[PDB]
Design a protein around this nucleic acid. Sequence first.
RNA 1: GGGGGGAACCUGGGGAACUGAAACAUCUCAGUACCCAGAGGAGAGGAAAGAGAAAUCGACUCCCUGAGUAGCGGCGAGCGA
RNA 2: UGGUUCGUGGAGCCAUGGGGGAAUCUGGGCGGACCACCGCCUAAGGCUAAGUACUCCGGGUGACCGAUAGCGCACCAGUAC
RNA 3: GUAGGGAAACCGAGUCCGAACAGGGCGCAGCGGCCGCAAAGUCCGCGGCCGUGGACCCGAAACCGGGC
RNA 4: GCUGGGGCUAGGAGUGAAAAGCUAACCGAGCCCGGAGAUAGCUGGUUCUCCCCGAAAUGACUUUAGGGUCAGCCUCAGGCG
RNA 5: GUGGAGCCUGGGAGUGAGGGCGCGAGCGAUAACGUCCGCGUCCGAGCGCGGGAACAACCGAGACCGCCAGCUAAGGCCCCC
RNA 6: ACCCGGUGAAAUUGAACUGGCCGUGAAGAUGCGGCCUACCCGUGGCAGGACGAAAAGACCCCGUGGAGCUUUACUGCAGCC
RNA 7: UGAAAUACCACCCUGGCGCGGCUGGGGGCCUAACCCUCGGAUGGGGGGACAGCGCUUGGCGGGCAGUUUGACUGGGGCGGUCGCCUCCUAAAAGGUAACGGAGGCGCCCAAAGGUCCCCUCAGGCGGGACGGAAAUCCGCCGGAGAGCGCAAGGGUAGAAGGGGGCCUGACUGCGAGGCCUGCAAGCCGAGCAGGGGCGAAAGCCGGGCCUAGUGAACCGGUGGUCCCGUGUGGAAGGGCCAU
Lengths: 53, 64
Amino acid sequence: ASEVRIKLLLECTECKRRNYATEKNKRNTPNKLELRKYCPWCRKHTVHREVKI
Amino acid sequence: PKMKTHKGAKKRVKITASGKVVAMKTGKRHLNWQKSGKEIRQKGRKFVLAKPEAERIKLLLPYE
RNA sequence: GGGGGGAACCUGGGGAACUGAAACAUCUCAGUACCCAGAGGAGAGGAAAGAGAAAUCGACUCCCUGAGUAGCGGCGAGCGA
RNA sequence: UGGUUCGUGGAGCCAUGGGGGAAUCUGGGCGGACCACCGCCUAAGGCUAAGUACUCCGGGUGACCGAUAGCGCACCAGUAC
RNA sequence: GUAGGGAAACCGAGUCCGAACAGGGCGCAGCGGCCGCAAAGUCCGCGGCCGUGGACCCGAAACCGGGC
RNA sequence: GCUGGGGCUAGGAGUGAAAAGCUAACCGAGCCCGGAGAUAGCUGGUUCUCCCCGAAAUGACUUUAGGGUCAGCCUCAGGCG
RNA sequence: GUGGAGCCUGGGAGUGAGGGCGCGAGCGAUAACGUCCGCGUCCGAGCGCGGGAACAACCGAGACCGCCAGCUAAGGCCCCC
RNA sequence: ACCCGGUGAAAUUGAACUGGCCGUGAAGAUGCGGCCUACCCGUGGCAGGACGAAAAGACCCCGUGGAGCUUUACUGCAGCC
RNA sequence: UGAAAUACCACCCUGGCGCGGCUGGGGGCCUAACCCUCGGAUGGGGGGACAGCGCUUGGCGGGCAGUUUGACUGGGGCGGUCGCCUCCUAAAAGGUAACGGAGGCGCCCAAAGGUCCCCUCAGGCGGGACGGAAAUCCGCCGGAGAGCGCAAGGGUAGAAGGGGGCCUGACUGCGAGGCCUGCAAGCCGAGCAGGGGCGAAAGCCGGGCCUAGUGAACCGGUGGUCCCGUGUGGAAGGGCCAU
Ligand SMILES: [Mg+2]
Ligand SMILES: [Mg+2]
Ligand SMILES: [Mg+2]
Ligand SMILES: [Mg+2]
Ligand SMILES: [Mg+2]
Ligand SMILES: [Mg+2]
Ligand SMILES: [Mg+2]
Ligand SMILES: [Mg+2]
Ligand SMILES: [Mg+2]
Ligand SMILES: [Mg+2]
Ligand SMILES: [Mg+2]
Ligand SMILES: [Mg+2]
Ligand SMILES: [Mg+2]
Ligand SMILES: [Mg+2]
Ligand SMILES: [Mg+2]
Ligand SMILES: [Mg+2]
Ligand SMILES: [Mg+2]
Ligand SMILES: [Mg+2]
Ligand SMILES: [Mg+2]
Ligand SMILES: [Mg+2]
Ligand SMILES: [Mg+2]
Ligand SMILES: [Mg+2]
Ligand SMILES: [Mg+2]
Ligand SMILES: [Mg+2]
Ligand SMILES: [Mg+2]
Ligand SMILES: [Mg+2]
Ligand SMILES: [Mg+2]
Ligand SMILES: [Mg+2]
Ligand SMILES: [Mg+2]
Ligand SMILES: [Mg+2]
Ligand SMILES: [Mg+2]
Ligand SMILES: [Mg+2]
Ligand SMILES: [Mg+2]
Ligand SMILES: [Mg+2]
Ligand SMILES: [Mg+2]
Ligand SMILES: [Mg+2]
Ligand SMILES: [Mg+2]
Ligand SMILES: [Mg+2]
Ligand SMILES: [Mg+2]
Ligand SMILES: [Mg+2]
Ligand SMILES: [Mg+2]
Ligand SMILES: [Mg+2]
Ligand SMILES: [Mg+2]
Ligand SMILES: [Mg+2]
Ligand SMILES: [Mg+2]
Ligand SMILES: [Mg+2]
Ligand SMILES: [Mg+2]
Ligand SMILES: [Mg+2]
Ligand SMILES: [Mg+2]
Ligand SMILES: [Mg+2]
Ligand SMILES: [Mg+2]
Ligand SMILES: [Mg+2]
Ligand SMILES: [Mg+2]
Ligand SMILES: [Mg+2]
Ligand SMILES: [Mg+2]
Ligand SMILES: [Mg+2]
Ligand SMILES: [Mg+2]
Ligand SMILES: [Mg+2]
Ligand SMILES: [Mg+2]
Ligand SMILES: [Mg+2]
Ligand SMILES: [Mg+2]
Ligand SMILES: [Mg+2]
Ligand SMILES: [Mg+2]
Ligand SMILES: [Mg+2]
Ligand SMILES: [Mg+2]
Ligand SMILES: [Mg+2]
Ligand SMILES: [Mg+2]
Ligand SMILES: [Mg+2]
Ligand SMILES: [Mg+2]
Ligand SMILES: [Mg+2]
Ligand SMILES: [Mg+2]
Ligand SMILES: [Mg+2]
Ligand SMILES: [Mg+2]
Ligand SMILES: [Mg+2]
Ligand SMILES: [Mg+2]
Ligand SMILES: [Mg+2]
Ligand SMILES: [Mg+2]
Ligand SMILES: [Mg+2]
Ligand SMILES: [Mg+2]
Ligand SMILES: [Mg+2]
Ligand SMILES: [Mg+2]
Ligand SMILES: [Mg+2]
Ligand SMILES: [Mg+2]
Ligand SMILES: [Mg+2]
Ligand SMILES: [Mg+2]
Ligand SMILES: [Mg+2]
Ligand SMILES: [Mg+2]
Ligand SMILES: [Mg+2]
Ligand SMILES: [Mg+2]
Ligand SMILES: [Mg+2]
Ligand SMILES: [Mg+2]
Ligand SMILES: [Mg+2]
Ligand SMILES: [Mg+2]
Ligand SMILES: [Mg+2]
Ligand SMILES: [Mg+2]
Ligand SMILES: [Mg+2]
Ligand SMILES: [Mg+2]
Ligand SMILES: [Mg+2]
Ligand SMILES: [Mg+2]
Ligand SMILES: [Mg+2]
Ligand SMILES: [Mg+2]
Ligand SMILES: [Mg+2]
Ligand SMILES: [Mg+2]
Ligand SMILES: [Mg+2]
Ligand SMILES: [Mg+2]
Ligand SMILES: [Mg+2]
Ligand SMILES: [Mg+2]
Ligand SMILES: [Mg+2]
Ligand SMILES: [Mg+2]
Ligand SMILES: [Mg+2]
Ligand SMILES: [Mg+2]
Ligand SMILES: [Mg+2]
Ligand SMILES: [Mg+2]
Ligand SMILES: [Mg+2]
Ligand SMILES: [Mg+2]
Ligand SMILES: [Mg+2]
Ligand SMILES: [Mg+2]
Ligand SMILES: [Mg+2]
Ligand SMILES: [Mg+2]
Ligand SMILES: [Mg+2]
Ligand SMILES: [Mg+2]
Ligand SMILES: [Mg+2]
Ligand SMILES: [Mg+2]
Ligand SMILES: [Mg+2]
Ligand SMILES: [Mg+2]
Ligand SMILES: [Mg+2]
Ligand SMILES: [Mg+2]
Ligand SMILES: [Mg+2]
Ligand SMILES: [Mg+2]
Ligand SMILES: [Mg+2]
Ligand SMILES: [Mg+2]
Ligand SMILES: [Mg+2]
Ligand SMILES: [Mg+2]
Ligand SMILES: [Mg+2]
Ligand SMILES: [Mg+2]
Ligand SMILES: [Mg+2]
Ligand SMILES: [Mg+2]
Ligand SMILES: [Mg+2]
Ligand SMILES: [Mg+2]
Ligand SMILES: [Mg+2]
Ligand SMILES: [Mg+2]
Ligand SMILES: [Mg+2]
Ligand SMILES: [Mg+2]
Ligand SMILES: [Mg+2]
Ligand SMILES: [Mg+2]
Ligand SMILES: [Mg+2]
Ligand SMILES: [Mg+2]
Ligand SMILES: [Mg+2]
Ligand SMILES: [Mg+2]
Ligand SMILES: [Mg+2]
Ligand SMILES: [Mg+2]
Ligand SMILES: [Mg+2]
Ligand SMILES: [Mg+2]
Ligand SMILES: [Mg+2]
Ligand SMILES: [Mg+2]
Ligand SMILES: [Mg+2]
Ligand SMILES: [Mg+2]
Ligand SMILES: [Mg+2]
Ligand SMILES: [Mg+2]
Ligand SMILES: [Mg+2]
Ligand SMILES: [Mg+2]
Ligand SMILES: [Mg+2]
Ligand SMILES: [Mg+2]
Ligand SMILES: [Mg+2]
Ligand SMILES: [Mg+2]
Ligand SMILES: [Mg+2]
Ligand SMILES: [Mg+2]
Ligand SMILES: [Mg+2]
Ligand SMILES: [Mg+2]
Ligand SMILES: [Mg+2]
Ligand SMILES: [Mg+2]
Ligand SMILES: [Mg+2]
Ligand SMILES: [Mg+2]
Ligand SMILES: [Mg+2]
Ligand SMILES: [Mg+2]
Ligand SMILES: [Mg+2]
Ligand SMILES: [Mg+2]
Ligand SMILES: [Mg+2]
Ligand SMILES: [Mg+2]
Ligand SMILES: [Mg+2]
Ligand SMILES: [Mg+2]
Ligand SMILES: [Mg+2]
Ligand SMILES: [Mg+2]
Ligand SMILES: [Mg+2]
Ligand SMILES: [Mg+2]
Ligand SMILES: [Mg+2]
Ligand SMILES: [Mg+2]
Ligand SMILES: [Mg+2]
Ligand SMILES: [Mg+2]
Ligand SMILES: [Mg+2]
Ligand SMILES: [Mg+2]
Ligand SMILES: [Mg+2]
Ligand SMILES: [Mg+2]
Ligand SMILES: [Mg+2]
Ligand SMILES: [Mg+2]
Ligand SMILES: [Mg+2]
Ligand SMILES: [Mg+2]
Ligand SMILES: [Mg+2]
Ligand SMILES: [Mg+2]
Ligand SMILES: [Mg+2]
Ligand SMILES: [Mg+2]
Ligand SMILES: [Mg+2]
Ligand SMILES: [Mg+2]
Ligand SMILES: [Mg+2]
Ligand SMILES: [Mg+2]
Ligand SMILES: [Mg+2]
Ligand SMILES: [Mg+2]
Ligand SMILES: [Mg+2]
Ligand SMILES: [Mg+2]
Ligand SMILES: [Mg+2]
Ligand SMILES: [Mg+2]
Ligand SMILES: [Mg+2]
Ligand SMILES: [Mg+2]
Ligand SMILES: [Mg+2]
Ligand SMILES: [Mg+2]
Ligand SMILES: [Mg+2]
Ligand SMILES: [Mg+2]
Ligand SMILES: [Mg+2]
Ligand SMILES: [Mg+2]
Ligand SMILES: [Mg+2]
Ligand SMILES: [Mg+2]
Ligand SMILES: [Mg+2]
Ligand SMILES: [Mg+2]
Ligand SMILES: [Mg+2]
Ligand SMILES: [Mg+2]
Ligand SMILES: [Mg+2]
Ligand SMILES: [Mg+2]
Ligand SMILES: [Mg+2]
Ligand SMILES: [Zn+2]
């Protein structure tokens, strides 16, 4: 992690809860992450989005 | 004069029915983003303190 | 009528530091030591603008207990209803 | 600001140095920010035995000392120095 | 002391995590001949060691208060 | 200039033609009594007899390094065998 | 393999300045009664005893007491002896 | 200073029946080994030794010891704005 | 006639003006609070609502106060060093010191991750326009000397290397049993459940060939939960999960 390799949370787009923390490089990956993850709340895979840590 | 309960131990620890000493795993207070889920999950449990360390903490809790 | 004295005890007005925190400043020591004023054979307190959950109690003082509980605390050392 | 367990804390309560500043029960204070409800209590005047503390003083009693002990002093000692 | 588990609400020989009737953590279960015997536990005594006190005795340089 | 007598200024204070000089024969903060049995991870000292066993001077961590906590190594009691 | 063996639960420690020597290395200079590790030993605690002239740790050897008895160990057997 | 009459201290002192050499030994030996030397006890003198005496080294380091002093160390206070 | 249309009366705006209330800032003057002063004083004179003094705000402040000012170390200082990784020392298990010998880390990758499928290097010689020691092409030899993001070591083509397709397992709930170990930490992990990815399937996937890329507690922030809520309902504030 650095000024350019930032930390970030991923949020259930269906239930709005942040379920995973991870990292990315914002120079190489400027767009907000979107990943399918298991939502422990919604109990199924859900598209999750990068949301500010 | 009577002994005093050590409040820092009273707040961190519990003496189980058989007199083991139990506390939360250390190491997920923060700096957690790059810790695997196995790590965070396992640090979420209680553990039984090593005997010499537990016996010491027990004497701080004379009235539990 | 006062004034001045009295070993401790008592109330009030002021009020440290070593030390402890294995350094130290908040904190501790401690509202202690000590200075002062005043009382008296005691002094203080005392008859709810109380307590605090009981549909309750019933001035104050003092002992046992409640309880090293509840809490307070560089949530440390410790302090403590 | 102090007091309380309460060190600024969600910090009420009691007290009060500064500023502002009411009402007389249809008044007011309180039950831990605040609000409502439901209760408790009557501030801004005073006094009040006893149960409590102490031991200069008198007496009684010691699995207390016995002249390097026990009070500093058993004796002309708060003396000689 | 006779119940534990849980931050807690709370449930209870269980309870906590968990979607779980999964898995796991921490818990639960005398001898002889109804009689005796032993025992949880608890009280008192005694002893070792620990905590708080000056805490095995003696020793500072210093610091603070009030006086001379 | 020196000197008698009579006075005033003191403890973080005085006084000093200045040396941290002097303030009652030791002043980089007087003396007495008190907090007080300050604290001393340092030095010293620690008192009868016999019998059994019998170490360590390493490791980890430590504002730690001649101090500690845990472990190792000694010893006692109970259990196992 | 029955030993002051071992294992388990608990009470009490002390130690956490080591040192010489042999072997294996590093450091040093194929120096130090040097230094720093490893394996072993002994002194430490066996400054008790024999040998080594004397001498903690080299060789011999683990001192419960007594004997005007015997055998040995290392080392010795010309006199000191 | 010395001798006789008179009066008569002191620090220090484990005890002492207290030689030299070459060695040895915690590395500078009266006290150990081997040798050498040496009748017993004083008085006046000298200072090489008794690591002589005095002073729990003042240099040096160590102690999470103290104090005085400094500053654009930290934190606060007086004072001033 | 435009969105709205006309005289006349209101409730109210844009801006601006003069009276006024009430004020905030400046300027001038007054006197009587307050201060100074005057043989004289219920007064005169001077300053004057300032100054002083109370409460509060922020600042300057060794004048003073309380203190702090690390350890290792062939004495101490000066210099150097302090955690983590790799090799050696290390005496063929583990471990093992010195201010012994050499180097590295404090990142990174949205692919540089999962899976399916495919492919195989460096280098040497010979051949080929621009074209060279070395660009790209063809041939033969070539087991790994290349590659594997970065130090080193171990590993590795029967792939961990290279290319492509689909993907997010860089899961959630746990976790038998172990490695290591004073503690606390650190490490590996089959398996079951939930919902997925790739694959025809067997199966693989709880990040990365591996060993560094890190920081306990306390205090606090943010999202969630809806557990506590000081007579009661809320609220304040806290707990819990995540960060
Ligand atoms: Mg605490
Ligand atoms: Mg944690
Ligand atoms: Mg933390
Ligand atoms: Mg957290
Ligand atoms: Mg948090
Ligand atoms: Mg990772
Ligand atoms: Mg994970
Ligand atoms: Mg994660
Ligand atoms: Mg979870
Ligand atoms: Mg109790
Ligand atoms: Mg219990
Ligand atoms: Mg009087
Ligand atoms: Mg009187
Ligand atoms: Mg008072
Ligand atoms: Mg008064
Ligand atoms: Mg006071
Ligand atoms: Mg004062
Ligand atoms: Mg203090
Ligand atoms: Mg003290
Ligand atoms: Mg203490
Ligand atoms: Mg201290
Ligand atoms: Mg201390
Ligand atoms: Mg200090
Ligand atoms: Mg202090
Ligand atoms: Mg104290
Ligand atoms: Mg106090
Ligand atoms: Mg007082
Ligand atoms: Mg007193
Ligand atoms: Mg009086
Ligand atoms: Mg009476
Ligand atoms: Mg009375
Ligand atoms: Mg009275
Ligand atoms: Mg009344
Ligand atoms: Mg109770
Ligand atoms: Mg107090
Ligand atoms: Mg107030
Ligand atoms: Mg207070
Ligand atoms: Mg708080
Ligand atoms: Mg309060
Ligand atoms: Mg007031
Ligand atoms: Mg009313
Ligand atoms: Mg009212
Ligand atoms: Mg009130
Ligand atoms: Mg009020
Ligand atoms: Mg209220
Ligand atoms: Mg009330
Ligand atoms: Mg009331
Ligand atoms: Mg009264
Ligand atoms: Mg009466
Ligand atoms: Mg009374
Ligand atoms: Mg009496
Ligand atoms: Mg009497
Ligand atoms: Mg008698
Ligand atoms: Mg006598
Ligand atoms: Mg006497
Ligand atoms: Mg006698
Ligand atoms: Mg008398
Ligand atoms: Mg006497
Ligand atoms: Mg006498
Ligand atoms: Mg006399
Ligand atoms: Mg279970
Ligand atoms: Mg019985
Ligand atoms: Mg019993
Ligand atoms: Mg103990
Ligand atoms: Mg005491
Ligand atoms: Mg004592
Ligand atoms: Mg004691
Ligand atoms: Mg003392
Ligand atoms: Mg002094
Ligand atoms: Mg001081
Ligand atoms: Mg001072
Ligand atoms: Mg003084
Ligand atoms: Mg004074
Ligand atoms: Mg004159
Ligand atoms: Mg004169
Ligand atoms: Mg005079
Ligand atoms: Mg004069
Ligand atoms: Mg003067
Ligand atoms: Mg003076
Ligand atoms: Mg004076
Ligand atoms: Mg002074
Ligand atoms: Mg001065
Ligand atoms: Mg002069
Ligand atoms: Mg004097
Ligand atoms: Mg003097
Ligand atoms: Mg003098
Ligand atoms: Mg002098
Ligand atoms: Mg001083
Ligand atoms: Mg002083
Ligand atoms: Mg006094
Ligand atoms: Mg004291
Ligand atoms: Mg004391
Ligand atoms: Mg001290
Ligand atoms: Mg000291
Ligand atoms: Mg003793
Ligand atoms: Mg033995
Ligand atoms: Mg060691
Ligand atoms: Mg450690
Ligand atoms: Mg450290
Ligand atoms: Mg530290
Ligand atoms: Mg020390
Ligand atoms: Mg130990
Ligand atoms: Mg053993
Ligand atoms: Mg033991
Ligand atoms: Mg036994
Ligand atoms: Mg046996
Ligand atoms: Mg044995
Ligand atoms: Mg043994
Ligand atoms: Mg014992
Ligand atoms: Mg110890
Ligand atoms: Mg020790
Ligand atoms: Mg040590
Ligand atoms: Mg050592
Ligand atoms: Mg040593
Ligand atoms: Mg050894
Ligand atoms: Mg050694
Ligand atoms: Mg030798
Ligand atoms: Mg050796
Ligand atoms: Mg040999
Ligand atoms: Mg060697
Ligand atoms: Mg080596
Ligand atoms: Mg040579
Ligand atoms: Mg040596
Ligand atoms: Mg050598
Ligand atoms: Mg050598
Ligand atoms: Mg050895
Ligand atoms: Mg020794
Ligand atoms: Mg021997
Ligand atoms: Mg031995
Ligand atoms: Mg011996
Ligand atoms: Mg010998
Ligand atoms: Mg011999
Ligand atoms: Mg011989
Ligand atoms: Mg020997
Ligand atoms: Mg024997
Ligand atoms: Mg024979
Ligand atoms: Mg022979
Ligand atoms: Mg011979
Ligand atoms: Mg003559
Ligand atoms: Mg004569
Ligand atoms: Mg003799
Ligand atoms: Mg002689
Ligand atoms: Mg020699
Ligand atoms: Mg000698
Ligand atoms: Mg010699
Ligand atoms: Mg001799
Ligand atoms: Mg002799
Ligand atoms: Mg001799
Ligand atoms: Mg001889
Ligand atoms: Mg000779
Ligand atoms: Mg002579
Ligand atoms: Mg001489
Ligand atoms: Mg002379
Ligand atoms: Mg001599
Ligand atoms: Mg000499
Ligand atoms: Mg000398
Ligand atoms: Mg001497
Ligand atoms: Mg001394
Ligand atoms: Mg000394
Ligand atoms: Mg010294
Ligand atoms: Mg010096
Ligand atoms: Mg030195
Ligand atoms: Mg020093
Ligand atoms: Mg320090
Ligand atoms: Mg230290
Ligand atoms: Mg200091
Ligand atoms: Mg100081
Ligand atoms: Mg000025
Ligand atoms: Mg004017
Ligand atoms: Mg005028
Ligand atoms: Mg005027
Ligand atoms: Mg004017
Ligand atoms: Mg003004
Ligand atoms: Mg005034
Ligand atoms: Mg203000
Ligand atoms: Mg201020
Ligand atoms: Mg200063
Ligand atoms: Mg300053
Ligand atoms: Mg000063
Ligand atoms: Mg202090
Ligand atoms: Mg510091
Ligand atoms: Mg420091
Ligand atoms: Mg040092
Ligand atoms: Mg050096
Ligand atoms: Mg050293
Ligand atoms: Mg060295
Ligand atoms: Mg040296
Ligand atoms: Mg040295
Ligand atoms: Mg340096
Ligand atoms: Mg690190
Ligand atoms: Mg090795
Ligand atoms: Mg090796
Ligand atoms: Mg090895
Ligand atoms: Mg080996
Ligand atoms: Mg191992
Ligand atoms: Mg170094
Ligand atoms: Mg480097
Ligand atoms: Mg790709
Ligand atoms: Mg890969
Ligand atoms: Mg792929
Ligand atoms: Mg080729
Ligand atoms: Mg070619
Ligand atoms: Mg060409
Ligand atoms: Mg070519
Ligand atoms: Mg390679
Ligand atoms: Mg590189
Ligand atoms: Mg798909
Ligand atoms: Mg396990
Ligand atoms: Mg472990
Ligand atoms: Mg599947
Ligand atoms: Mg599945
Ligand atoms: Mg499929
Ligand atoms: Mg798996
Ligand atoms: Mg990779
Ligand atoms: Mg990696
Ligand atoms: Mg980690
Ligand atoms: Mg803290
Ligand atoms: Mg801390
Ligand atoms: Mg928190
Ligand atoms: Mg409520
Ligand atoms: Mg609720
Ligand atoms: Mg309330
Ligand atoms: Mg409502
Ligand atoms: Mg509710
Ligand atoms: Mg609401
Ligand atoms: Mg909330
Ligand atoms: Mg919340
Ligand atoms: Mg959490
Ligand atoms: Zn969800």
